[PDB]
PDB file of all heavy atoms in Angstrom:
ATOM      1  N   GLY D 226       6.367 -26.852  42.892  1.00  0.00           N
ATOM      2  CA  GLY D 226       5.759 -26.912  44.210  1.00  0.00           C
ATOM      3  C   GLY D 226       4.343 -27.445  44.212  1.00  0.00           C
ATOM      4  O   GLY D 226       3.483 -26.907  44.922  1.00  0.00           O
ATOM      5  N   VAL D 227       4.078 -28.492  43.434  1.00  0.00           N
ATOM      6  CA  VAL D 227       2.756 -29.099  43.365  1.00  0.00           C
ATOM      7  C   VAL D 227       2.930 -30.584  43.082  1.00  0.00           C
ATOM      8  O   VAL D 227       3.881 -30.999  42.415  1.00  0.00           O
ATOM      9  CB  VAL D 227       1.869 -28.428  42.291  1.00  0.00           C
ATOM     10  N   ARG D 228       1.999 -31.387  43.597  1.00  0.00           N
ATOM     11  CA  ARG D 228       2.065 -32.832  43.441  1.00  0.00           C
ATOM     12  C   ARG D 228       0.799 -33.458  42.874  1.00  0.00           C
ATOM     13  O   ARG D 228       0.810 -34.663  42.597  1.00  0.00           O
ATOM     14  CB  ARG D 228       2.385 -33.503  44.785  1.00  0.00           C
ATOM     15  N   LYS D 229      -0.275 -32.692  42.687  1.00  0.00           N
ATOM     16  CA  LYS D 229      -1.539 -33.197  42.151  1.00  0.00           C
ATOM     17  C   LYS D 229      -2.042 -34.389  42.968  1.00  0.00           C
ATOM     18  O   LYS D 229      -2.136 -35.519  42.485  1.00  0.00           O
ATOM     19  CB  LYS D 229      -1.401 -33.558  40.670  1.00  0.00           C
ATOM     20  N   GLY D 230      -2.354 -34.113  44.232  1.00  0.00           N
ATOM     21  CA  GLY D 230      -2.801 -35.134  45.160  1.00  0.00           C
ATOM     22  C   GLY D 230      -4.032 -35.892  44.710  1.00  0.00           C
ATOM     23  O   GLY D 230      -5.014 -35.292  44.263  1.00  0.00           O
ATOM     24  N   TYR D 231      -3.982 -37.221  44.818  1.00  0.00           N
ATOM     25  CA  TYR D 231      -5.109 -38.048  44.391  1.00  0.00           C
ATOM     26  C   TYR D 231      -6.379 -37.759  45.176  1.00  0.00           C
ATOM     27  O   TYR D 231      -7.445 -37.604  44.552  1.00  0.00           O
ATOM     28  CB  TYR D 231      -4.723 -39.527  44.492  1.00  0.00           C
ATOM     29  N   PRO D 232      -6.357 -37.674  46.505  1.00  0.00           N
ATOM     30  CA  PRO D 232      -7.591 -37.434  47.264  1.00  0.00           C
ATOM     31  C   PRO D 232      -7.947 -35.968  47.461  1.00  0.00           C
ATOM     32  O   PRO D 232      -8.942 -35.686  48.138  1.00  0.00           O
ATOM     33  CB  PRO D 232      -7.280 -38.098  48.615  1.00  0.00           C
ATOM     34  N   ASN D 233      -7.152 -35.045  46.914  1.00  0.00           N
ATOM     35  CA  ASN D 233      -7.399 -33.608  47.000  1.00  0.00           C
ATOM     36  C   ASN D 233      -7.354 -33.108  48.440  1.00  0.00           C
ATOM     37  O   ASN D 233      -7.656 -31.940  48.705  1.00  0.00           O
ATOM     38  CB  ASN D 233      -8.742 -33.251  46.355  1.00  0.00           C
ATOM     39  N   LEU D 234      -6.986 -33.976  49.372  1.00  0.00           N
ATOM     40  CA  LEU D 234      -6.877 -33.620  50.781  1.00  0.00           C
ATOM     41  C   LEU D 234      -5.528 -33.981  51.381  1.00  0.00           C
ATOM     42  O   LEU D 234      -5.004 -33.222  52.201  1.00  0.00           O
ATOM     43  CB  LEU D 234      -8.001 -34.297  51.584  1.00  0.00           C
ATOM     44  N   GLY D 235      -4.952 -35.121  50.994  1.00  0.00           N
ATOM     45  CA  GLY D 235      -3.667 -35.517  51.549  1.00  0.00           C
ATOM     46  C   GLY D 235      -2.551 -34.558  51.186  1.00  0.00           C
ATOM     47  O   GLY D 235      -1.647 -34.309  51.989  1.00  0.00           O
ATOM     48  N   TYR D 236      -2.599 -34.001  49.975  1.00  0.00           N
ATOM     49  CA  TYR D 236      -1.578 -33.066  49.521  1.00  0.00           C
ATOM     50  C   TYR D 236      -1.681 -31.703  50.193  1.00  0.00           C
ATOM     51  O   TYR D 236      -0.817 -30.852  49.954  1.00  0.00           O
ATOM     52  CB  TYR D 236      -1.658 -32.901  48.002  1.00  0.00           C
ATOM     53  N   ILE D 237      -2.706 -31.472  51.010  1.00  0.00           N
ATOM     54  CA  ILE D 237      -2.861 -30.207  51.720  1.00  0.00           C
ATOM     55  C   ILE D 237      -3.049 -30.486  53.205  1.00  0.00           C
ATOM     56  O   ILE D 237      -3.142 -29.556  54.015  1.00  0.00           O
ATOM     57  CB  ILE D 237      -4.038 -29.392  51.156  1.00  0.00           C
ATOM     58  N   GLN D 238      -3.112 -31.771  53.568  1.00  0.00           N
ATOM     59  CA  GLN D 238      -3.356 -32.142  54.960  1.00  0.00           C
ATOM     60  C   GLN D 238      -2.209 -31.710  55.865  1.00  0.00           C
ATOM     61  O   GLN D 238      -2.439 -31.206  56.972  1.00  0.00           O
ATOM     62  CB  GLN D 238      -3.580 -33.650  55.069  1.00  0.00           C
ATOM     63  N   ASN D 239      -0.967 -31.905  55.419  1.00  0.00           N
ATOM     64  CA  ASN D 239       0.179 -31.515  56.234  1.00  0.00           C
ATOM     65  C   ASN D 239       0.197 -30.011  56.470  1.00  0.00           C
ATOM     66  O   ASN D 239       0.483 -29.548  57.581  1.00  0.00           O
ATOM     67  CB  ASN D 239       1.476 -31.969  55.566  1.00  0.00           C
ATOM     68  N   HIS D 240      -0.111 -29.232  55.436  1.00  0.00           N
ATOM     69  CA  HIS D 240      -0.092 -27.783  55.573  1.00  0.00           C
ATOM     70  C   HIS D 240      -1.257 -27.292  56.421  1.00  0.00           C
ATOM     71  O   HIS D 240      -1.109 -26.325  57.180  1.00  0.00           O
ATOM     72  CB  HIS D 240      -0.100 -27.146  54.188  1.00  0.00           C
ATOM     73  CG  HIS D 240       1.168 -27.372  53.425  1.00  0.00           C
ATOM     74  ND1 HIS D 240       1.769 -26.383  52.675  1.00  0.00           N
ATOM     75  CD2 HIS D 240       1.949 -28.468  53.296  1.00  0.00           C
ATOM     76  CE1 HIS D 240       2.864 -26.863  52.114  1.00  0.00           C
ATOM     77  NE2 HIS D 240       2.997 -28.126  52.475  1.00  0.00           N
ATOM     78  N   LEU D 241      -2.412 -27.954  56.324  1.00  0.00           N
ATOM     79  CA  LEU D 241      -3.512 -27.652  57.232  1.00  0.00           C
ATOM     80  C   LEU D 241      -3.117 -27.940  58.674  1.00  0.00           C
ATOM     81  O   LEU D 241      -3.447 -27.168  59.581  1.00  0.00           O
ATOM     82  CB  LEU D 241      -4.752 -28.456  56.841  1.00  0.00           C
ATOM     83  N   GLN D 242      -2.404 -29.045  58.904  1.00  0.00           N
ATOM     84  CA  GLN D 242      -1.935 -29.362  60.249  1.00  0.00           C
ATOM     85  C   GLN D 242      -0.946 -28.319  60.752  1.00  0.00           C
ATOM     86  O   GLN D 242      -0.970 -27.944  61.930  1.00  0.00           O
ATOM     87  CB  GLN D 242      -1.305 -30.754  60.271  1.00  0.00           C
ATOM     88  N   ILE D 243      -0.058 -27.845  59.876  1.00  0.00           N
ATOM     89  CA  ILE D 243       0.906 -26.821  60.273  1.00  0.00           C
ATOM     90  C   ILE D 243       0.190 -25.526  60.642  1.00  0.00           C
ATOM     91  O   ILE D 243       0.513 -24.881  61.652  1.00  0.00           O
ATOM     92  CB  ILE D 243       1.940 -26.596  59.154  1.00  0.00           C
ATOM     93  N   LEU D 244      -0.789 -25.121  59.829  1.00  0.00           N
ATOM     94  CA  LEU D 244      -1.564 -23.926  60.147  1.00  0.00           C
ATOM     95  C   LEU D 244      -2.330 -24.103  61.452  1.00  0.00           C
ATOM     96  O   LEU D 244      -2.436 -23.166  62.252  1.00  0.00           O
ATOM     97  CB  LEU D 244      -2.522 -23.601  59.000  1.00  0.00           C
ATOM     98  N   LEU D 245      -2.871 -25.301  61.681  1.00  0.00           N
ATOM     99  CA  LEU D 245      -3.572 -25.577  62.930  1.00  0.00           C
ATOM    100  C   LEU D 245      -2.631 -25.473  64.122  1.00  0.00           C
ATOM    101  O   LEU D 245      -3.010 -24.948  65.171  1.00  0.00           O
ATOM    102  CB  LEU D 245      -4.217 -26.961  62.875  1.00  0.00           C
ATOM    103  N   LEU D 246      -1.402 -25.973  63.980  1.00  0.00           N
ATOM    104  CA  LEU D 246      -0.431 -25.869  65.066  1.00  0.00           C
ATOM    105  C   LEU D 246      -0.070 -24.415  65.347  1.00  0.00           C
ATOM    106  O   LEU D 246       0.053 -24.011  66.510  1.00  0.00           O
ATOM    107  CB  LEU D 246       0.821 -26.678  64.729  1.00  0.00           C
ATOM    108  N   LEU D 247       0.112 -23.616  64.294  1.00  0.00           N
ATOM    109  CA  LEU D 247       0.408 -22.198  64.494  1.00  0.00           C
ATOM    110  C   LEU D 247      -0.746 -21.488  65.193  1.00  0.00           C
ATOM    111  O   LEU D 247      -0.533 -20.692  66.121  1.00  0.00           O
ATOM    112  CB  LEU D 247       0.719 -21.532  63.155  1.00  0.00           C
ATOM    113  N   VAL D 248      -1.980 -21.769  64.766  1.00  0.00           N
ATOM    114  CA  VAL D 248      -3.145 -21.165  65.404  1.00  0.00           C
ATOM    115  C   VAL D 248      -3.258 -21.630  66.849  1.00  0.00           C
ATOM    116  O   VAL D 248      -3.665 -20.869  67.732  1.00  0.00           O
ATOM    117  CB  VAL D 248      -4.421 -21.486  64.604  1.00  0.00           C
ATOM    118  N   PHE D 249      -2.901 -22.888  67.110  1.00  0.00           N
ATOM    119  CA  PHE D 249      -2.920 -23.411  68.470  1.00  0.00           C
ATOM    120  C   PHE D 249      -1.924 -22.675  69.353  1.00  0.00           C
ATOM    121  O   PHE D 249      -2.234 -22.332  70.497  1.00  0.00           O
ATOM    122  CB  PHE D 249      -2.624 -24.912  68.446  1.00  0.00           C
ATOM    123  CG  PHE D 249      -2.852 -25.607  69.759  1.00  0.00           C
ATOM    124  CD1 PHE D 249      -3.982 -26.381  69.955  1.00  0.00           C
ATOM    125  CD2 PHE D 249      -1.940 -25.490  70.796  1.00  0.00           C
ATOM    126  CE1 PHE D 249      -4.200 -27.023  71.158  1.00  0.00           C
ATOM    127  CE2 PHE D 249      -2.152 -26.130  72.001  1.00  0.00           C
ATOM    128  CZ  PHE D 249      -3.284 -26.898  72.181  1.00  0.00           C
ATOM    129  N   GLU D 250      -0.717 -22.429  68.839  1.00  0.00           N
ATOM    130  CA  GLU D 250       0.271 -21.679  69.609  1.00  0.00           C
ATOM    131  C   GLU D 250      -0.212 -20.260  69.888  1.00  0.00           C
ATOM    132  O   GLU D 250      -0.076 -19.755  71.011  1.00  0.00           O
ATOM    133  CB  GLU D 250       1.608 -21.657  68.871  1.00  0.00           C
ATOM    134  N   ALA D 251      -0.788 -19.605  68.876  1.00  0.00           N
ATOM    135  CA  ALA D 251      -1.300 -18.251  69.075  1.00  0.00           C
ATOM    136  C   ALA D 251      -2.420 -18.229  70.110  1.00  0.00           C
ATOM    137  O   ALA D 251      -2.458 -17.349  70.980  1.00  0.00           O
ATOM    138  CB  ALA D 251      -1.782 -17.672  67.747  1.00  0.00           C
ATOM    139  N   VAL D 252      -3.334 -19.198  70.038  1.00  0.00           N
ATOM    140  CA  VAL D 252      -4.447 -19.256  70.979  1.00  0.00           C
ATOM    141  C   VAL D 252      -3.945 -19.561  72.382  1.00  0.00           C
ATOM    142  O   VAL D 252      -4.477 -19.044  73.370  1.00  0.00           O
ATOM    143  CB  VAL D 252      -5.488 -20.288  70.513  1.00  0.00           C
TER     144      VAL D 252
END
């Protein structure tokens, strides 16, 4: 469950977006 993302952000960007969407729904 790891990909060693080159920019250290793209490999976590999708999950940050998912968390943002969940927080948006809660808000």
Side-chain angles (χ1 to χ4, degrees), residues 226 230 232 235 240 249 251:
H240 291 222
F249 190 103

